[PDB]
Design a protein around this ligand. Structure first.
Ligand SMILES: *[C@@H]1O[C@H](CO)[C@@H](O)[C@H](O)[C@H]1NC(C)=O
Ligand SMILES: CCCCCCCCCCCC
Ligand SMILES: CCCCCCCCCCCC
Ligand SMILES: CCCCCCCCCCCC
Ligand SMILES: CCCCCCCCCC
Ligand SMILES: CCCCCCCCCC
Ligand SMILES: CCCCCCCCCC
Ligand SMILES: CCCCCCCCCC
Ligand SMILES: CCCCCCCCCC
Ligand SMILES: CCCCCCCC
Ligand SMILES: CCCCCCCC
Ligand SMILES: CCCCCCCC
Ligand SMILES: CCCCCCCC
Ligand SMILES: CCCCCCCC
Ligand SMILES: [Cl-]
Length: 545
């Protein structure tokens, strides 16, 4: 039937990129103006690049870096770029789990701390959400106060880091020990039975979706979600945000999907899996958007303010709307605990894969010194310890601004488009898209349609180059919560996080050419020839030519 096929592919597609990052990227970039670039990218590059990575991993049966060595010795810096991207992503991704852990620990009390505002941390300007319109120039929602006063202690700027938050630093330490202990002991990402690890994220999202839609203001919230704003499409930032949100959700350009495709058998219809997971992954983001944007629609009409100015246009929208929804539910504390466990399990499974993914790449990159045993176990703690210390810069009071620097630059924006363009450019134009079909038709049993070939050759490079060029032409500097202007050095620092991964592709080209000996034209020709990528006798494999 069809349920067994869904069971075989599990439910690991859902992550924090769906229930945390998508809603606020949609919220920041107007309303439904985010969806047109979202779907254009999803059907032009999103699914094609995802399937390309899977099928390259399956064809070469190699990891992130060695697969590119098999496909094309030149442009092999894509693996190193992916390693840098995933390292920065692991540095800034565990902070979300730190916030989730803090919220979960704060939810273990009789009265939710964000339900009412009469506490110590609360500005006198705060007023209850119900009484803002029921009955002093501006008032603040208790939910937003708790987020920027208790959880983040927001400082005036990034240049004022302030004293470290010892409560978040421990919550950051706990999730790193969990990542360290699980990876060191070889614990699977899904604990025990996979049913609870996969059905629970959907069950909680359905409950939140049901709660959101029945709220009185949900009608105006969805009209904000769905109906687009064309004048927003003039801005080239919405295309970048929507384009790389697909890449972030699919975990492509990270080297994760190549390794995921490696475990697939040679004769395996991975084409169906990429389409099925891709639609389910992007489908969850669309459906989860209905839940959160209904809450904002309810929040905006309750406070008598616009939907576009009711919450934070930045990370933590899922920490303002969702904790607000659980306040309007029977047994609010019970649902608050479950939500932040789900929000924590989703992130932990994603973090388990990437931290182990980059470590596996790192140890295999420099063997004879990181050999399996005492040396590797120390390396497991070394990667986490350094990633913990660098992650401490986003825990200070001015740590939200540093988090937005990493989020907008380190593993999103031009750095993800740079790799996605170069993965498609090498396969479609250098290796040959028609050549890959001969490999694919031998693998999945039938030659696919012209969609995949024409998406690597044309659609993805034009989308990545076009968005890259037009982002620089109409350059608007990064801003946090649409009111804070970053200092020049912060953007220069942020551009370095992107540029650190982007420079791997040209730098390895320079290294490779100088390593090779001979005339320059002979040198470039030698490094563009694949080194027998389909070299496996375990299954029936036709020679590349
Ligand atoms: C106060 O609320 C008004 C009306 O929504 C808004 O125009 C203004 O920017 C707010 N000012 C502050 C300080 O939040
Ligand atoms: C908005 C959806 C974009 C889908 C792109 C599909 C490309 C197919 C090209 C086939 C040409 C023969
Ligand atoms: C003047 C003090 C500025 C402090 C800004 C902190 C930025 C942290 C960057 C972390 C790079 C990995
Ligand atoms: C700028 C920080 C990451 C730089 C990575 C460079 C990798 C070069 C490896 C060359 C191997 C032949
Ligand atoms: C985040 C910068 C360091 C990440 C390591 C990249 C790979 C180095 C070995 C070639
Ligand atoms: C007031 C009811 C709004 C319903 C919106 C359309 C259904 C979305 C289901 C995901
Ligand atoms: C007072 C701010 C403390 C920030 C600590 C940052 C540690 C970075 C280690 C590389
Ligand atoms: C550096 C990449 C140049 C690609 C030129 C077109 C393909 C050449 C090999 C057939
Ligand atoms: C615009 C100049 C920026 C200089 C300070 C930031 C550099 C970060 C990498 C060391
Ligand atoms: C007025 C309808 C209440 C709905 C509560 C939703 C709990 C799952
Ligand atoms: C953010 C980088 C952490 C260190 C990774 C290990 C380098 C060999
Ligand atoms: C669902 C609309 C876009 C379909 C793209 C072509 C798939 C073969
Ligand atoms: C390639 C564009 C770099 C822009 C850096 C701006 C630093 C002020
Ligand atoms: C005035 C320069 C501040 C630099 C902060 C650290 C950047 C890595
Ligand atoms: Cl998504």
């Amino acid at each position: 039937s069809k349920i067994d096929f869904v069971l075989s592919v599990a439910g690991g597609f859902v992550g924090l990129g769906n229930v945390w990052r998508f809603p606020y990227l949609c919220y920041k970039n107007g309303g439904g103006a985010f969806l047109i670039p979202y779907f254009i990218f999803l059907f032009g590059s999103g699914l094609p690049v995802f399937f390309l990575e899977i099928i390259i991993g399956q064809y070469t049966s190699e990891g992130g870096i060695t697969c590119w060595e098999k496909i094309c010795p030149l442009f092999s810096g894509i693996g190193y770029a992916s390693v840098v991207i995933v390292s920065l992503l692991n540095v800034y991704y565990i902070v979300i789990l730190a916030w989730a852990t803090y919220y979960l620990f704060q939810s273990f009390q009789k009265e939710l701390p964000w339900a009412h505002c009469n506490h110590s941390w609360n500005t006198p300007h705060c007023m209850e959400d119900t009484m803002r319109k029921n009955k002093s120039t501006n008032f603040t929602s208790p939910v937003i106060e708790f987020w920027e006063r208790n959880v983040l202690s927001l400082s005036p700027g990034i240049d004022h880091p302030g004293s470290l938050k010892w409560d978040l630093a421990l919550c950051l330490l706990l999730v790193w020990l969990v990542c360290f202990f699980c990876i060191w002991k070889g614990v699977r990402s899904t604990g025990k039975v996979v049913y609870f690890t996969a059905t629970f994220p959907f069950a909680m999202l359905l409950v939140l979706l049901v709660r959101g839609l029945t709220l009185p203001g949900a009608g105006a919230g969805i009209k904000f979600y769905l109906y687009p704003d064309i004048t927003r499409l003039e801005d080239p930032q919405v295309w970048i945000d929507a384009g790389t949100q697909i890449f972030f959700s699919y975990a492509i350009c990270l080297g994760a999907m190549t390794s995921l495709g490696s475990y697939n058998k040679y004769k395996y219809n991975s084409y169906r899996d990429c389409m099925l997971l891709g639609c389910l992954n992007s489908g969850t983001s669309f459906v989860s958007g209905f839940a959160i944007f209904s809450i904002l629609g309810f929040m905006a009409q309750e406070q008598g303010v616009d939907i576009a100015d009711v919450a934070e246009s930045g990370p933590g929208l899922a920490f303002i709307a969702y904790p607000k929804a659980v306040t309007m539910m029977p047994l609010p504390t019970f649902w608050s605990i479950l939500f932040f466990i789900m929000l924590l399990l989703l992130g932990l499974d994603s973090q388990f894969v990437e931290v182990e993914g980059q470590i596996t790449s790192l140890v295999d990159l420099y063997p004879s010194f990181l050999r399996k045993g005492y040396r590797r176990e120390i390396f497991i703690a070394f990667v986490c310890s350094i990633s913990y210390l660098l992650g401490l810069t986003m825990v200070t009071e001015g740590g939200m601004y540093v988090f937005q620097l990493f989020d907008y630059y380190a593993a999103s924006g031009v750095c993800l488009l740079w790799v996605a363009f170069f993965e498609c450019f090498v396969i479609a134009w250098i290796y040959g898209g028609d050549n890959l079909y001969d490999g694919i038709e031998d693998m999945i049993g039938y030659r696919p349609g012209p969609w995949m070939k024409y998406s690597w050759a044309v659609i993805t490079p034009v989308l990545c180059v076009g968005c890259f060029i037009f982002s620089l032409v109409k350059y608007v500097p990064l801003t946090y919560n649409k009111t804070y202007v970053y200092p020049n050095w912060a953007i220069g620092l942020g551009w370095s996080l992107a540029l650190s991964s982007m420079l791997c592709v040209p730098l390895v080209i320079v290294i490779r050419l100088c390593q090779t000996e001979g005339p320059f034209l002979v040198r470039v020709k030698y490094l563009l020839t694949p080194r027998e990528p389909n070299r496996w006798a375990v299954e029936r494999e036709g020679a590349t030519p």
